[PDB]
Write a protein that holds these residues in place. Structure first.
Motif, PDB file in Angstrom:
ATOM      1  N   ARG A 112       0.111   4.877  -1.994  1.00 60.09           N
ATOM      2  CA  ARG A 112       0.607   5.508  -0.740  1.00 60.09           C
ATOM      3  C   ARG A 112       0.067   4.561   0.318  1.00 60.09           C
ATOM      4  N   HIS A 113      -1.153   4.150   0.110  1.00 61.62           N
ATOM      5  CA  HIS A 113      -1.809   3.214   1.060  1.00 61.62           C
ATOM      6  C   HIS A 113      -0.848   2.075   1.452  1.00 61.62           C
ATOM      7  N   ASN A 138       3.234   4.515   1.741  1.00 66.43           N
ATOM      8  CA  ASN A 138       3.082   5.503   2.824  1.00 66.43           C
ATOM      9  C   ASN A 138       2.763   4.735   4.083  1.00 66.43           C
TER      10      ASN A 138
END
Length: 13
Positions: free
Chosen positions: A2-3, A6
């Motif tokens: 996600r880092h 996202n």
């Protein structure tokens, strides 16, 4: 990831 997926939405969306 996600880092990066996202963060990608936080930066592209």
């Amino acid at each position: 990831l996600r880092h990066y997926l996202n963060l990608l939405t936080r930066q592209r969306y």
